[PDB]
Design a protein around this ligand. Structure first.
Ligand SMILES: NC(=O)c1ccc[n+]([C@@H]2O[C@H](COP(=O)([O-])OP(=O)(O)OC[C@H]3O[C@@H](n4cnc5c(N)ncnc54)[C@H](OP(=O)(O)O)[C@@H]3O)[C@@H](O)[C@H]2O)c1
Ligand SMILES: CCc1nc(N)nc(N)c1OCCCOc1cccc(C[C@@H](C(=O)O)C(F)F)c1
Ligand SMILES: [Cl-]
Ligand SMILES: [Cl-]
Ligand SMILES: [Cl-]
Length: 158
C-alpha cells in the first residue's frame, strides 16, 4: 500500500513534550481525523500511550502499535514488532522514532506547522526533516480557535 506520514510540529520541529503535544489546535485534530478516517494508522508504543483515554483506540481506523516488547497488548489495537509488519492507504501517525523508521517507505507527508516558539529541549520528540527530494506546497496562515496560528503543508516524494 501507499504509506503517508502525518504530523503537527512547531516551527522549531517539536512534535511532543512530557508525554503529550504542547499545544491545542482543534483544526489540526479535525484535519488529522479527516485524512486518517477509515485507514490504518500506525504508531509507536509511546504515541499509543499518549492518546487521551477517551480517544484510544482511535475510532474508525485500524490501530497498529509498534513495539519491541513481547506480549504487549493494546486493547482494541493490533501490535507488531517492526514497521514492515505494520505495512502488510496506511498513515503513520508518529511519534518521532516511528516517523524515522517510516520516512524511507513513504511517498506523501501531510504536515501542520504551528506558529509557537518552543526551543527544543531534552527529551522532546522532534519532527523528521524532509530533504529537497520532497516536493511541497503550503496553505495559508490561519488563526486557530485556540489562539495559535497554523498552516498545512503537503509533500510528495519526487
Ligand atoms: N505532534 C504530532 O504530530 C505527534 C504525533 C505523534 C506523537 N506525538 C508526541 O510524540 C511523543 C511520542 O513520540 P516518541 O518519539 O517518544 O515515541 P514513538 O515513536 O511514538 O514510540 C517509541 C516506541 O516505539 C517502539 N519502537 C521504536 N523503534 C522500534 C523498532 N525499530 N522496532 C520496534 N518497535 C520500535 C518502542 O516501543 P517499546 O518501548 O514499547 O519497545 C519505542 O519506545 C509524545 O509526546 C506524543 O504526544 C506528537
Ligand atoms: C492530533 C495530533 C496530530 N496531528 C497531526 N496532524 N498528525 C498527527 N500525527 C497527530 O498526532 C496523532 C496522535 C495524537 O492523536 C490524537 C490526540 C488527541 C485526540 C485524538 C482524537 C481525534 C481523532 O479522532 O482523530 C479527535 F479528537 F478528532 C487524536
Ligand atoms: Cl491535556
Ligand atoms: Cl487539539
Ligand atoms: Cl480540547
Amino acid at each position: 500500500t501507499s504509506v503517508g506520514l502525518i504530523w503537527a510540529q512547531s516551527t522549531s520541529g517539536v512534535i511532543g513534550r512530557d508525554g503529550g503535544i504542547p499545544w491545542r489546535l482543534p483544526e489540526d485534530l479535525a484535519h488529522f481525523k479527516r485524512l486518517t478516517m477509515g485507514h490504518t494508522v500506525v504508531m509507536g508504543r509511546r504515541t499509543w500511550d499518549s492518546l487521551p483515554a477517551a480517544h484510544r483506540p482511535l475510532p474508525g481506523r485500524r490501530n497498529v502499535v509498534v513495539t519491541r516488547q513481547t506480549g504487549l497488548v493494546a486493547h482494541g489495537a493490533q501490535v507488531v514488532g517492526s514497521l514492515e509488519q505494520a505495512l502488510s492507504a496506511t498513515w503513520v501517525i508518529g511519534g518521532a522514532q516511528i516517523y524515522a523508521l517510516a520516512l524511507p517507505l513513504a511517498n506523501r507527508c501531510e504536515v501542520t506547522e504551528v506558529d509557537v516558539d518552543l526551543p527544543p529541549e531534552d527529551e522532546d520528540a522532534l519532527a523528521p526533516v524532509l530533504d529537497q527530494t520532497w516536493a511541497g506546497t503550503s496553505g495559508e496562515w490561519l488563526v486557530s480557535r485556540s489562539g495559535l496560528r497554523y498552516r498545512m503543508h503537503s509533500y510528495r516524494r519526487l
